[PDB]
Amino acid sequence: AVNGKGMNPDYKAYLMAPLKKIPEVTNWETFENDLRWAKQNGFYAITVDFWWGDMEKNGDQQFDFSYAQRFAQSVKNAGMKMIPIISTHQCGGNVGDDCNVPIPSWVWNQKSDDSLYFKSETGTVNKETLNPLASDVIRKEYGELYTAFAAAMKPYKDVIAKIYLSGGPAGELRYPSYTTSDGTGYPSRGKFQAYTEFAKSKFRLWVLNKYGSLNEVNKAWGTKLISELAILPPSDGEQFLMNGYLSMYGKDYLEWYQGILENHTKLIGELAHNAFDTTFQVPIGAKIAGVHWQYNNPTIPHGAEKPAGYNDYSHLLDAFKSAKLDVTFTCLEMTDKGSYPEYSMPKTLVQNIATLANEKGIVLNGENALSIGNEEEYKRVAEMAFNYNFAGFTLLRYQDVMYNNSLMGKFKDLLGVTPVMQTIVVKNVPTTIGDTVYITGNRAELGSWDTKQYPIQLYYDSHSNDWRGNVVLPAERNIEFKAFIKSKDGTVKSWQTIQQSWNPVPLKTTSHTSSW
Template sequence: MRKLSYSLIAYMLCVVALFSSFSTAQAEVKPNYKSYVMAPLGEITDWEEFKKQLIQLKESGVYALTTDVWWGKVEGTGDNQFDWSYYEKYADVVESSGLKWVPIISTHQCGGNVGDDCNYPIPAWLWEKDSIENMAFKSESGYLNKEALAPWWGGIENQYNELYKSFAENFADEKELIVKIYLSGGPAGELRYPSYQFADGWEYPQRGKLQAYSEGAKKDFGLFIQEKYPTIQELNAAWGTELGSWSEIQPPNNGEKFFRSGEAYNTQYGKDFMEWYQSTLEDHIEKIANVAHMQFDNTFNVPIGAKIAGVHWKMNDPEMPHSAEYSAGYYKYSQLLDQFKQSNLAITFTCLEMGDHDAYNPPYYSAPRTLVTQIANLANVRGISLNGENALPLINNEWGFDNSAEAVFNYNFDGFTLLRMNHLFDSEGNQTNEFNMMADKLGVTPIPVTFTVKDVPAANGQEVYLIGDRGEIGRWNTAEHKYKLTQNSDDTWTGTFNLAADRSYEFKFFLKDEDGKITWQNLETNRYHTPSIGTGEYSASW
């Protein structure tokens, strides 16, 4: 193996000596980590060219192709009138390429969201089943959204059960091909509310709009509150109101004021509303998971999963923190992931390609890397299978691929799904730079590196952390790539983690006490640089 070695002299105001060396032991990379690619949204017309491209993906180390199976395409002509012929052809071509297949049972509309380049509405005949006020979402502005069925509509279980059952019956002979099945939980296939929708006037990085204003939503909110408070008197005591009947219970009459005034965070009314708002998502995923397990487990015996969106903006907004997440229905992630665990569902989480560079910059207050690590840690504690994905339909730079690779390699992800296949080939069918970066960064074994730190002024109960980044001037961010170091018997501290190849790194150190307070740091006075780390055996010392 090729060996790299070097020495680096740095001025140190605090006496810290450290060295790093290649470790043959993998850090936290799962031995069964797999790379996936998501198929184009639109319809395949040139099957031969499609197959050629799939074979190239297979040869590059990709394990499986992930495909939206559009509800509007397979049951669009009428209730229980299924036509699976297109996806049967699709499965045959995937199988002939050598790839495995991950179908997404896409019960949402394609069109209107970021990266959508097709138009597949959900079946039109559905809207004859009940009133639009019971079946659709309605926002603060009064906009009616029909891109997915509202979770409080009572007919969802039956409709999904028929769809799932028909899929299982028609693809039972593809047991060896299908390795996982994903369920669409809402808009864009994600378990969330359609709070950030262009057609409703939303622009990034605005908060988005609450979706609690249809008659069906108001009724469901009222029932939730009645179940929590036995009498209207107890409700008034908790909320500080003088309601005369249950029918007077309403969602916030001004969503912006609800957040900016602190009502969402500091009042019992606000907390109760947000509890209900998220609980509808929890109830929804529980129902569809139960139906999916009933229809798929005996036939396919594969993991079933759903996607949570990486709503990373407004996280640190000083006036309304986490308001974008709240508007999308993400109020308490730990409680939401408890439901995934109870429902025996895997999770795909997005925005792994992004960094925290705008974490405290208005108007974004965007902290995607912090959010990724938060969700990963919650999933790992619960033993939930975790898969990563980029948020935008194209990762067009090396930095984004590095971020994605280091997240999955160090936070116990089972795999990563790249959006989207059509960006990996040009109009002539040739591999693009995105294809090469995918293969280099996400399809190869990462490099485990062990760092040992000496002479750190640590006291009992403190923890030493190493922070690593690409070292670009002006782009340093302490929220990225934190790795805890453990204390050895000789008062040194050691930590092993994974790095992507062909990249230079910059490292700093700091100490935190039991309350998370930083007690010592060398962030500005000492920065330790490496040259570009290649593949093969790696050793270094300072």
């Protein structure tokens, strides 16, 4: 893996449940059979959306956690674990949405102003989730829902492995910048969603709070605004994305725009920890979308990410760290294109996020953006997961593998693996001062024969006078590997003579010993 390391010891595979209720797509008895089959194929837990529109449908504090508890019982019956997603977002309207579960309609009556929803540059209204700006309502409702859900799930704390929060559209922490109705779907540039009267006033007061007065604002932006009401978000989104973003105004607007998402993260994180920590003691996570299109566009750089709220990934990730939330990223199955008209750089995106997460000590998890029907995609997911220190991978979605034995088996082989610690010992390595030893092998867990950035580093054991290392390998999988020396300057000096193999890697810890 990157930086002489191996696969993450805590790696786990998860499976996404259907979008609809089990009773609609199947029956409880069969569901339990499925869960046992999934487990048989390396899946540790099943992630599931518990829709806000279902749990507090009729009115404020009129909860219905019956489905959730029933679901939990079957998971317990199957001998599995579950990862619930408190979905405070709408089901239906996004890609792959075979459902229609809006958020509680009575919530929109709480406010008389447009503070609860989103409005695009062109006036397209979005209501598939609450606008992070209405923190007062978010605090009341999410606090109430998180606490209520905790109480109802208390009896099943044993089958709950982790809890996901919903940061916005599709359960991701972002703005609804890419929708068909707004005409901003992939691979188009996104539109900013801060055009409600409420959003305008918040930005204005935020700016005035930072500078104090219009005189100091104009002095900082090098502008000539006559009135405070002139302080407004980008009237021309494309122009802003072309060069407007480079100005002091641009920096300020993007700071606020993204800041709203960072504060949201710290809020829902605080409420979540307060609600679940004492009872469950499990990690809580949230998701960051994979806005890979218009990434390397020359005229409008990151033209889709910015309107979604993603301007400074490093700054965004600090919010997760402080809120004590694990991060989940998607697009692990895709590869870079970076060509007109899409300018799609998914792989590059993932690598950057992973590197940032890893340097910040944030636990990282991944998902596939779209359904997979070929082992090739699984292979890509494997390269990223095992080489970029991902703590877990969640397959989207249930039906894809549950009703296809061939695809299910390939998933088992490549991704449904159990990481086991093993000691690799190499004897008689003709090293010179400055020489470092490494091993690389066929599987993605061993760096896929890469010698540049994915090899696993070995160290010299002065007591036994050899090179060895505690490497984490996939249990019960056949592997082929070879040791090699790297000169001080970072170039391959030589390779071990005979190719080594372990058919298969033992489930129990031991050591593979070979000579140069």
